[PDB]
From Swiss-Prot:
The keyword Transferase applies. One of its GO terms (cellular component) is cytoplasm. Both divalent cations appear to be equally efficient in an vitro reconstitution assay. Pfam families: NTP_transf_3 (PF12804). One of its GO terms (molecular function) is nucleotidyltransferase activity. It is found in: Cytoplasm. This is Molybdenum cofactor guanylyltransferase. It comes from the Bacteria. Monomer. An equilibrium exists between a monomeric and oligomeric form of the enzyme, which could be an octamer; whether this oligomeric arrangement is of functional relevance is unclear. Interacts with MoeA and MobB in vivo. NCBIfam families: molyb_mobA. It comes from Escherichia coli (strain K12). The N-terminal domain determines nucleotide recognition and specific binding, while the C-terminal domain determines the specific binding to the target protein. When the N-terminal domain of MobA is fused to the C-terminal domain of MocA, comparable kinetic constants as wild-type MobA are obtained with GTP, and the activity with CTP is completely lost. Consistent results are obtained when the N-terminal domain of MocA is fused to the C-terminal domain of MobA: the kinetic constants with CTP are comparable with the ones found for wild-type MocA, although no activity with GTP is detected.
C-alpha cells in the first residue's frame, strides 16, 4: 500500500563466527544501521532490515528483520534477492548499513531520474554506490538467475539489468561510509 519499501542491508555470511557486526557499531550512541533506517523512514513509511547475525538485537527497534535464504548466495545481491522474495510490492530502495548520512531526497531523486530504467543507483561524483539502489520487482527473476549461475558481481549485474547511475555529486559527503571501527571513531 506504499510505493517503495526501504531496506537496510546489514550484511550476510558470518563466514567465520562473524567478526565485528558493522551495523551494530554505535555512532553517537546509535547503531549505524539505525541511522540508515531512520534516514529511510524520513522518506518512506515502510522500512525493513536484512540481517543474518544478532537478529534479536536488530529486532529491538521494532522493524521487520529479514534473513537470507538457505541458498547462501554471495555478496550484497543475495540480501537484495532474499528481501524481494520475502516482501511484496513493486519497488525497493536498498542502502547498506554503513552510510549513516544518506539524504532525505534519496528516494525522490532516484525516482525522478529513473527515466524508465528498472534499476538506478547513486554516484557521488567520485564513485558508484551500486548497493544504494532503487530496484523494480521485475529484477527479481534476473537476480535469481544470476545468483543461481554462481555470479556475485554487483556492478556487472546492475549493468546486465539495464540500470544507470544517478548523479548525487552535489550532496556533499552524504554518502561517506564507515568501513571499520577505526574509521567510525573519527566521526564521533
Ligand atoms: Li558473537
Amino acid at each position: 500500500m506504499t510505493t517503495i519499501t526501504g531496506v537496510v542491508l546489514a550484511g550476510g555470511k558470518a563466514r567465520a563466527m562473524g567478526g565485528v557486526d558493522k551495523g551494530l557499531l554505535e555512532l553517537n550512541g546509535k547503531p549505524l544501521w539505525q541511522h540508515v533506517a531512520d534516514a529511510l523512514m524520513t522518506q518512506l513509511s515502510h522500512v525493513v532490515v536484512n540481517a543474518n547475525r544478532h537478529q534479536e538485537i536488530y529486532q529491538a527497534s521494532g522493524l521487520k528483520v529479514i534473513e537470507d535464504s538457505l541458498a547462501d548466495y554471495p555478496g550484497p545481491l543475495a540480501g537484495m534477492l532474499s528481501v524481494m522474495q520475502q516482501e511484496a510490492g513493486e519497488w525497493f530502495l536498498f542502502c547498506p548499513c554503513d552510510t549513516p548520512y544518506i539524504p532525505p531526497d534519496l528516494a525522490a531523486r532516484l525516482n525522478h531520474q529513473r527515466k524508465d530504467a528498472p534499476v538506478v543507483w547513486v554516484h557521488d561524483g567520485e564513485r558508484d554506490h551500486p548497493t544504494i539502489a532503487l530496484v523494480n520487482r521485475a529484477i527479481e527473476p534476473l537476480l535469481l538467475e544470476y545468483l543461481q549461475a554462481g555470479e556475485r558481481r554487483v556492478m556487472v549485474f546492475m549493468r546486465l539489468a539495464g540500470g544507470h547511475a544517478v548523479d548525487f555529486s552535489d550532496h556533499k559527503d552524504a554518502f561517506v561510509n564507515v568501513n571499520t571501527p577505526e574509521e567510525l571513531a573519527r566521526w564521533q
